[PDB]
Design a protein around this ligand. Structure first.
Ligand SMILES: OC[C@H]1O[C@@](CO)(O[C@H]2O[C@H](CO)[C@@H](O)[C@H](O)[C@H]2O)[C@@H](O)[C@@H]1O
Ligand SMILES: OC[C@H]1O[C@@](CO)(O[C@H]2O[C@H](CO)[C@@H](O)[C@H](O)[C@H]2O)[C@@H](O)[C@@H]1O
Ligand SMILES: [Ca+2]
Ligand SMILES: [Ca+2]
Ligand SMILES: [Mg+2]
Ligand SMILES: [Mg+2]
Ligand SMILES: [Mg+2]
Ligand SMILES: [Mg+2]
Lengths: 564, 569
């Protein structure tokens, strides 16, 4: 039976500001994306989601939204967006928008009206009174010790309103009150507006932070978060507190289930292709699985993002660690759940930087060959590395607020946001201008899409071979078997009776490894190399005939073998 | 017809039972368990379907750490009995077909050992038997003596004790009275061979080897001729005398310890080659991360170590906070990380940790013993798990565990004390649960002995003990010794474990580990064809052994566990 599109799509995250500049201002834009929609068809991408493109002061490059109903002028107009949707659908692509429900810009009308106590907006954000200060009574203390994800107090004093407002993110990102039925209605209004425009669904931002302790349950006070007791964190630094009262509250999931109830209604009433929500939240695996639904029968996000290849694996990982981490989502996911696999995003170091340059193909093979949904971040299809960004060039508010000239590199997301490497032209073909909002990585001459399209073997040609492979019943409907053959090498087998068997072998280590292919289930020899790492001695079409296989450091093969 | 199978070597699928001799059976009314006690109940292990027993330490000991402080590694502690009682235990155990393993503590000796008395005196052959160090130079005021480093004892305080006699510090990672051997001393390493040969020659079938993570510490040659400080944890809740104040980078899990273990295995392999009869084995004790734990089996350069390291995952990583997905995921860790050729093992308790039904729940006893017995490899049972013994209440006044006496006080002792898991075994409802004829026992008998005792569980229709016997009996079936395993969660509440083998019966555990009821589709369980028969059920299950499962829809109560017997694949 053929699956609904979202159950095995290749999903590509576009960071619009760094994708394509169509107008020589050094800033990626919608006309730029429209100009390269054909790239997604060439790559074998099914669906694109864009990081935020709504009206925003750009304090957090779009995650601070001042109007949820119109396009950010630097990216273009409502008309450009409508054209992007039209041409993407024409090419067969699905298009998801980055919805940011936790917070609004302090330049939003919601906030201005709330700060001024305009009726029906007074309780739109979290507003609280100061505490008195025993050590210097002149210096007001905030309602609680809560710490912002971007450093300092999560509480900002409003001169105008004579109260503190909550900001789990930047001072300029103001936390909506999700116990307010008017806030919750406004979220339906925003989603209805963009679905009415033709959007294929939403990526839902920062959900762990939706709800904080109600002061009603704590004698009218905001309860302090427990202390970590780690001496490397001072009271203004993220890590000083354990976010017991400020993150992963059980009530956040009820909001998500209400969103899915609304979306299921909409899909029923409008028909056509299913519109989906994919949720973003870094949390422990059990809190992450409540985004899918709960055991009482609630249904949530079509899936929450799996960040395990970001959070729990790196160049420090061995083959047993790879297998053990891959098994986590597969062990914890509810029955009928769609697995997904994320290798990078705009908040984390790029895939080849976190792992090694020689592991790029193996990592893209894992993404494409595991059951479910492959997620690609902008650049991973060509093996883009972290770009060098000086203190002087750093614009990430997280790095500016938490960091300084000596430390900024511990915090900055900018190195994973440097402009896309189209070719070896000025600014790697991202712009006609040499003034890119972030500096272009120094290695764009070695690493760009044009070069990879015209070399016999490249990351991009491997990417294309893998997205093409996902059309095979073996990958859409086959079983999986995964195990380590040593500390250095593991296998992943997809099998399905009467259909071809596909086997990943991946030496994730820095050393040669010789493995016994007789230990691999469902693998009969001779077998044919379908894809090999760009540094493999073995080419596509090569026959593997010996049961003893030496893999070089980082080497990955996909073998096509006889059906079970 | 059912295929023939070649029987496994004994140690690859034994049920291994840990005896804590002080708490097992008092034969003489002193309230202290003893060897004649154990001899009198060797038939209990045959009745239970145990293949091998290991005893916590019975060697001469001042009893500061109840046997782990050994003053003579070549004789028996007088409270437990004599060498002759030991020889008698071995003979009668072997006559009944049991294997017997001794617990040997290689890391440290009693300060009452001749080794330490000779070492403290700088006697030739023994001066460098232990780790002796000068004070750290304190030029900033030479008046005050500083210890060699900030190292913290596992039992609280400095790991360094000043000897007025020798005018140097000695290392004790445990109690002041437990002195760390120098494992870079070839004479120490040879003495460890001499001890194991002596007990193998008596006819021990092998050893459990204690506290192996602590064998080797940093060599001052690598740190400019001083003992390097352990890094600070920087946790606000620990001061410099408190375990937790340091990270044991220079004091635990050093790579050189594994070379000692591989040398033990080399010595044992040669001994087995030169004596024949059944393989003698070493099982290693070490609490460490999974990568450091698997190095006990061997390494990927071909080194071979312990027959296995103990798997403590059901103690360290699962509890009553765990759901069915946690259970599966933790079970998969040993199976994923274990090297090719390695024998899995499963440990639910010991003399250092809370009892299984206390860590989990009282309603989970059967399900936990089923997991132990149905998983592939070796089931390890701690004294009392076969009847579902719970922790005993032990007051501060009755607390004798040196770790609690050193680290704890009237308000805190319960955080550290191992005594609740060491309370005397519940034989029956007589005086002191039939452990002793006296009302005076070395630790108090748990208050629930009238409700939880072996004799009662033999007389009643359904019991933890009767389920245990049924499971150890099932382990003789080819499906459990030789069969494949499949394990997955059906929900957050219920997982399955299927043992299957073409032409032999299929066996399926279904376990609701949650506090809520769960209904599951048995159609999702691989190799399960209905109708199927309940082989074992939890003592409060709606289903008795022999109950026919015909419906593909199965409702399980909180804690309920079933083993189903189903037609061969
Ligand atoms: O380091 C970023 C920080 O924020 C998270 C929260 O889920 O990411 C999302 O939310 C932020 C505020 O809207 C954005 O800055 C970020 O870009 C967005 O993806 C996590 O990545 C992390 O905790
Ligand atoms: O809490 C006790 C402490 O010691 C360990 C070390 O592996 O256990 C063994 O070593 C001790 C000293 O010989 C004994 O007191 C203990 O009974 C013995 O099992 C661990 O359980 C722990 O780290
Ligand atoms: Ca919030
Ligand atoms: Ca030692
Ligand atoms: Mg532009
Ligand atoms: Mg970060
Ligand atoms: Mg006695
Ligand atoms: Mg303890």
């Amino acid at each position: 039976i053929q699956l609904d599109w979202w159950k095995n799509c290749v999903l590509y995250q576009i960071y619009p500001r760094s994708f394509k500049d169509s107008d020589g201002d050094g800033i990626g834009d919608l006309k730029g994306i429209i100009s390269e929609l054909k790239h997604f068809v060439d790559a074998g991408v099914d669906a694109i989601w864009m990081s935020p493109i709504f009206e925003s002061p750009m304090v957090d490059f779009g995650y601070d939204i001042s109007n949820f109903y119109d396009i950010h002028y630097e990216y273009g107009t409502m008309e450009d967006f409508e054209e992007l949707l039209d041409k993407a659908h024409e090419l067969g692509l699905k298009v998801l928008l980055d919805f940011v429900p936790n917070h609004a810009s302090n330049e939003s009308e919601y906030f201005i009206k709330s700060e001024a106590r305009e009726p029906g907006y007074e309780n739109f954000f979290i507003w609280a009174d100061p505490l008195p200060n025993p050590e210097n009574p002149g210096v007001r203390l905030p309602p609680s010790n809560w710490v912002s994800q971007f450093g300092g107090s999560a509480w900002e004093w409003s001169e105008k309103r004579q109260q503190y407002y909550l900001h789990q993110f930047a001072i300029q990102q103001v936390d909506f009150d999700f116990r307010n039925p008017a806030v919750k209605q406004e979220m339906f209004n925003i989603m209805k507006f963009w679905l009415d425009k033709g959007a294929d669904g939403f990526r839902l931002d920062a959900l762990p932070y939706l709800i904080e302790a109600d002061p009603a349950d704590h004698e009218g006070r905001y309860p302090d978060d427990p202390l970590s007791g780690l001496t490397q964190f001072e009271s203004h630094q993220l890590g000083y507190t354990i976010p017991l009262y400020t993150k992963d509250l059980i009530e956040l999931y009820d909001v998500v289930y209400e969103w899915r109830e609304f979306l299921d209604e909409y899909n029923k009433n409008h028909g056509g292709d299913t519109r989906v929500v994919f949720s973003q939240g870094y949390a422990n695996v059990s809190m992450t699985m409540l985004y899918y639904g709960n055991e009482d029968g609630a249904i949530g996000a079509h899936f929450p993002f799996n960040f395990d290849f970001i959070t729990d694996l790196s160049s420090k990982s061995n083959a047993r660690d790879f297998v053990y981490i891959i098994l986590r989502w597969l062990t914890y996911m509810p029955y009928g759940g769609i697995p997904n696999w994320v290798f990078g995003n705009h908040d984390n170091n790029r895939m080849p930087t976190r792992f090694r340059h020689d592991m790029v193909d193996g990592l893209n093979i894992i993404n494409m060959l595991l059951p479910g949904v492959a997620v690609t971040y902008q650049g991973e299809e060509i093996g883009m590395r972290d770009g060098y960004v000086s203190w002087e060039d750093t614009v990430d508010i997280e790095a500016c607020n938490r960091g300084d000239p000596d430390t900024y590199h511990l915090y900055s997301r900018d190195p994973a946001r440097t402009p896309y490497h189209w070719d070896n032209s000025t600014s790697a073909g991202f712009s006609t201008s040499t003034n890119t909002w972030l500096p272009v990585a120094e290695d764009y001459q070695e690493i760009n899409l044009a070069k990879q399209k015209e070399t016999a073997r490249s990351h991009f040609k491997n990417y294309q071979a893998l997205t093409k492979l996902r059309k095979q019943a073996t990958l859409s409907h086959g079983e999986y078997d995964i195990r380590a053959l040593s500390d250095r090498t593991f296998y992943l087998v997809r099998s399905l009776p009467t259909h071809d068997t596909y086997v990943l072998l991946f030496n994730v280590s820095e050393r040669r490894d010789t493995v016994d292919l007789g230990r691999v289930p469902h693998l009969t020899l001779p077998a044919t190399v379908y894809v090999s790492s760009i540094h493999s001695a073995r080419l596509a079409g090569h026959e593997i005939t010996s049961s003893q296989l030496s893999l070089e450091a980082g080497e990955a093969l996909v073998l096509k073998a006889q059906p079970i």
